[PDB]
Design a protein around this ligand. Structure first.
Ligand code: NAG
Ligand code: NAG
Ligand code: NAG
Ligand code: NAG
Ligand code: NAG
Ligand code: NAG
Ligand code: NAG
Lengths: 39, 161, 175, 314, 49, 48
């Protein structure tokens, strides 16, 4: 979780705070035609 | 469960639940204010199903400062803790990695809805921020308080220009 | 567009369709520049409001003494001093803070000789069996006389009036 | 303050489309600057509430014996017999103002309604039991019929004019407070100035949702049909018009929000100044704290604002 | 106060041409937003005075 | 002196000066902050 904040701010240090880093996103997972009369 | 659904078209992604809407017999699907398909009649069994979008929200990383510690806490905004060591539920969202401590301190890191977080010094704790120290004044209808001394204060105020 | 550098666009493609790429790049960059200037106008409005506040604070804090309750710092304003800063100003607000308060007994008026007396300035306070006129925000008790008290009525209409002697300054030397 | 809004840029511009997300990364620092702007707006809203309401240091309390020389503060003092420890007038104020949709989310404020109510209660208790002394130092306590005498001195009227008319004066105040509530109950649009912002915010957000249905000159506003029925050479170019259009609409929303937040910040600065001079003192400034010679003022909370009850001498 | 201005979308963006107006309806609620903003500005000017 | 340069299709205009930065042997360009082309090597005589 920290690394990703570091990557977002383009810095190797993070000062004290709440930082919004990403988005959580749960993931996903008849009238028959009369051929019989002809054939 | 989050499924990719297709009902005579109407391709979408969400969770399908039983509903209680009263569709007229000629109506196939419903639409919310803002035009989002909210319900659907399945062609086979003619049941009315509500569609709810999959869980989503922001992720906030509460850090006590890299120079202080590498511990973090994670806040999932608007997400119930029924979905994805400590797990705590706040009006702001689901807080993971912070132990709720029921002693009230001043706010260090604002989480929200009156709940703040701080580095205990050791672990990251979450508490309900305190407004201040209660001081009932001794009101009476024949008593006054008069100061017998003074102090001189030099306050500093910075204003951009 | 195909690329962000104009050399590739102008070299690899002839002007006929390279015109569309150039127009797309120009529109994007004009949009970014206009966004920048709009943001700058908003920020300059914010800074102008701050500078108007700082000018008012210089006028009312530095060139005078302010009665506005928390304008020129917290406490009863005494004075202020300006200090230059890179893109701003720093005000040193010298203020007066009361301290070391003490409890006393008060009465809104003093019934003497059948008439009520109210203090011209200050309050009536007591330490037990003794009553004094003091100033409001610094304990400095003085004896109750007619020089610091104003008569106004009989003492049967004021709720909470106590009765005590009020010294007459002309009584002893003239009699 | 406003509502603290947030937008997941991808889900608004793309949604369930993976190809849209892949294409969106080309633009770069657009979504970053929009997110920074909205975060700044939200932090500014919290700062506005903090500056207006959190002026008091300690959390003062009112004595159990609520006799203040005949003045009746029951309509402004909190009522313990309710789940929310708000005053009778504040309850009417909250009742009279009626207040995860495709990326547009609303962040709860840092201070809850009960915390703002407790701040207001502390301000009321300090004002009643100390006068103006609790805003400039130690909270020194004085009888309430003697604060009124000091304030009459402040408006240029001698002390005795209070003590000789105290009961009458008290009754007048009480009656006024009563009428106040009826007034708030009478004119529904009395708090319109406080409802408008709510309405305005909703309107803006509504427009944003509507902007998600516009074609922007493309064949359709649905990404699925464009990706299904078309070849990549025109599909990706057709989407580019749907991404540019949606980015433009989102940027317009953010700019309008910035202007509105500037207006709300000006209003919150005015509210903090009113709390400083009107509530924590007596103002000689002519029409700042109500029509007539200002005597005192009382704060009350409201869903996104503050209500000042200005007691003045006419 | 400042000048109260009102703007007609069709006569600016499109002019007399009947054909382009026919194209213009597809953009949606831009002009509602624009006219609402300008009316707000005008009412604000009257309130200032 | 300000001069157009065309390094194997790398077209630009500027003042070329004796470089003082140490390109490692696998580097054929130079970028400053914000991706500004700050130094270049000649694809013919290999000069920085
Ligand atoms: C810790 O490092 C931060 C920067 O990462 C710096 O701002 C802070 O002053 C440092 N504190 C100490 C105690 O070294
Ligand atoms: C969140 O999950 C809990 C399960 O522990 C459930 O009781 C609660 O109703 C859920 N919240 C909402 C808003 O549905
Ligand atoms: C701390 O306070 C919380 C308040 O919700 C309560 O649930 C918890 O049991 C308390 N814990 C202790 C050890 O008192
Ligand atoms: C004044 O009296 C109150 C109540 O008797 C008491 O709490 C307070 O400490 C007293 N202050 C001083 C300075 O004696
Ligand atoms: C009250 O104060 C006066 C003067 O300071 C002193 O003479 C007197 O003895 C005091 N009385 C008590 C009860 O402290
Ligand atoms: C103060 O209040 C009490 C009870 O409220 C009352 O008995 C007493 O007479 C009052 N004193 C004054 C001076 O008003
Ligand atoms: C204060 O006013 C209310 C409303 O009229 C009334 O019910 C209450 O009795 C009054 N309070 C006192 C202490 O008389």
């Amino acid at each position: 979780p920290l690394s990703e904040t570091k990557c977002t701010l383009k810095s190797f240090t993070v000062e004290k705070g709440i930082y919004q880093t990403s988005n959580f996103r749960v993931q996903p997972t008849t009238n028959l035609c009369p051929f019989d009369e002809v054939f | 469960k989050c499924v990719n659904f297709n009902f005579n078209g109407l391709k979408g992604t969400g969770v399908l639940t039983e509903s209680n809407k009263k569709f007229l017999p000629f109506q196939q699907f419903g639409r919310d204010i803002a035009d989002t398909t909210d319900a659907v009649r399945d062609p086979q069994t003619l049941e009315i199903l509500d569609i709810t979008p999959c869980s989503f929200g922001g992720v906030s990383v509460i850090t006590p400062g890299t120079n202080t510690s590498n511990q973090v806490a994670v806040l999932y905004q608007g997400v119930n803790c029924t979905e994805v060591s400590n797990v705590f539920q706040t009006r702001a969202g689901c807080l993971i990695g912070a132990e709720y401590v029921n002693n009230s301190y001043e706010c260090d890191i604002p989480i929200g809805a009156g709940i703040c977080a701080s580095y205990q010094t050791q672990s990251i704790i979450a508490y309900t921020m305190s407004l201040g120290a209660e001081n009932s004044v001794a009101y009476s209808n024949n008593s006054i308080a008069i100061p017998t001394n003074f102090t001189i204060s030099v306050t500093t105020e910075i204003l951009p220009v | 567009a195909i690329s962000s550098v104009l050399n590739d666009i102008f070299s690899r493609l002839d002007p006929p369709e390279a015109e569309v790429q150039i127009d797309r790049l120009i529109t994007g960059r004009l949009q970014s520049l206009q966004t920048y200037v709009t943001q700058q106008l908003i920020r300059a409005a914010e800074i102008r409001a701050s500078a108007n506040l700082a000018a008012t604070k210089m006028s009312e804090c530095v060139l005078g003494q302010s009665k506005r309750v928390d304008f020129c710092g917290k406490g009863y304003h005494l004075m202020s001093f300006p200090q230059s800063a890179p893109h701003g100003v720093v005000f040193l607000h010298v203020t007066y803070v009361p301290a070391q308060e003490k409890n006393f007994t008060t009465a809104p008026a003093i019934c003497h000789d059948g008439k009520a007396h109210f203090p011209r300035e200050g309050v009536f306070v007591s330490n037990g069996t003794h009553w004094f006129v003091t100033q409001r925000n610094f304990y400095e008790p003085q004896i109750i006389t007619t020089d610091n008290t104003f008569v106004s009525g009989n003492c049967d209409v004021v709720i909470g009036i106590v009765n005590n002697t009020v010294y007459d300054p002309l009584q002893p030397e003239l009699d | 303050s406003m509502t603290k809004t947030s937008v997941d840029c991808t889900m608004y511009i793309c949604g369930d489309s993976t190809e849209c997300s892949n294409l969106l990364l080309q633009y770069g620092s657009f979504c970053t600057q929009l997110k920074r702007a909205l975060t700044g707006i939200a932090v500014e809203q919290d700062k506005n509430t903090q500056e207006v309401f959190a002026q008091v240091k300690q959390i003062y309390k009112t004595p159990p014996i609520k006799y203040f020389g005949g003045f009746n503060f029951s309509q402004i003092l909190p009522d313990p017999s309710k789940p929310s420890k708000r005053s009778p007038i504040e309850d009417l104020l909250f009742n009279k103002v009626t207040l995860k949709f495709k990326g547009l989310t609303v962040l709860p404020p840092l201070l809850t309604d009960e915390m703002i109510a407790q701040y207001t209660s502390a301000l009321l208790a300090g004002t009643i039991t100390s006068g103006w002394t609790f805003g400039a130092g130690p909270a020194l306590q004085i009888p309430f019929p003697m604060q009124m005498a000091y304030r009459f001195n402040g408006i240029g009227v001698t002390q005795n004019v209070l003590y000789e008319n105290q009961k009458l004066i008290a009754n007048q105040f009480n009656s006024a407070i009563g009428k106040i509530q009826d007034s708030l109950s009478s004119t529904p649009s009395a708090l319109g100035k406080l409802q408008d912002v709510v309405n305005h915010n909703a309107q803006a957000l509504n427009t944003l949702v509507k902007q998600l249905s516009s074609k922007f000159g493309a064949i359709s506003s649905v990404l699925n049909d464009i990706f299904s029925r078309l070849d990549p050479p025109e599909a990706e170019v057709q989407i580019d018009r749907l991404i540019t259009g949606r980015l433009q609409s989102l940027q317009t929303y953010v700019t309008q929000q910035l202007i509105r937040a500037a207006e709300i910040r000006a209003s919150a600065n005015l509210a903090a100044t009113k709390m400083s001079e009107c509530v924590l003192g007596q103002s000689k400034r002519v029409d700042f704290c109500g029509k007539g010679y200002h005597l005192m003022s009382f704060p009350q909370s409201a869903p996104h604002g503050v209500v000042f009850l200005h007691v003045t001498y006419v």
